Amino acid sequence: IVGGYTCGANTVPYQVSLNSGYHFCGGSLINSQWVVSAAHCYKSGIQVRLGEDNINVVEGNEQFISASKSIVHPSYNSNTLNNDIMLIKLKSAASLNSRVASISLPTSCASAGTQCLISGWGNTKSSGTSYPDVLKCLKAPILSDSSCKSAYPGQITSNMFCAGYLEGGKDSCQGDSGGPVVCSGKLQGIVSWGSGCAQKNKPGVYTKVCNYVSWIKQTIASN
Numbered sequence: 001i002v003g004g005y006t007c008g009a010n011t012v013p014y015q016v017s018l019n020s021g022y023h024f025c026g027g028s029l030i031n032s033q034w035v036v037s038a039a040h041c042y043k044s045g046i047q048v049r050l051g052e053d054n055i056n057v058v059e060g061n062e063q064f065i066s067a068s069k070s071i072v073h074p075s076y077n078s079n080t081l082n083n084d085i086m087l088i089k090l091k092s093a094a095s096l097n098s099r100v101a102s103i104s105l106p107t108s109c110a111s112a113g114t115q116c117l118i119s120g121w122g123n124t125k126s127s128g129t130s131y132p133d134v135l136k137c138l139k140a141p142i143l144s145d146s147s148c149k150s151a152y153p154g155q156i157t158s159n160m161f162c163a164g165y166l167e168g169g170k171d172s173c174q175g176d177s178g179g180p181v182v183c184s185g186k187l188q189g190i191v192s193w194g195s196g197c198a199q200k201n202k203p204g205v206y207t208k209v210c211n212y213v214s215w216i217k218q219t220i221a222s223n
């Protein structure tokens, strides 16, 4: 996250770290057995790390659970990043507490101008490299249709939205991928892509979770 703030310990109890010997992506706990992330975050050998704040120290509240299976969306296109969503089933159920909570799935899509919370352990500079050890947060609006597609002509689908600031300075970045965008209590987004970070006229692009609820429910019920 660029231009954000230090969330504060376990203030985002649904935020997950995906680890393969190191942190590589974020995720969202949707129930004691399932995590949602981005399909471009697919790897083998995933361990899901819950209740984190400092990903470089063992601070007590953490639960480290291996993935038993991963399911990338049937129509994921790695070239376009259309349908950038994946489900990750935990080997063993997580214990839900004050530091580890699930996030609700949307009942409807959010409108432009809605205030969201975006969080992650990604790079905090728009120019150069600086990776935080602690969770970073960002308050950002959902941008209009037109503003999103004007920035990225011919690249935006129905399954995407933009959020952030046209003036730049505030955005998600490398390492935030697969992490949550929570608006009015619901998981509306997944950190997907963008043209660099916190650059002018290039907002972040997010997977539009409200299009996928049916798929998520049927899939989780059958697996």
Ligand SMILES: [Ca+2]
Pocket: 052, 053, 054, 055, 056, 057, 058, 059, 060, 062
């Ligand atoms: Ca820790």
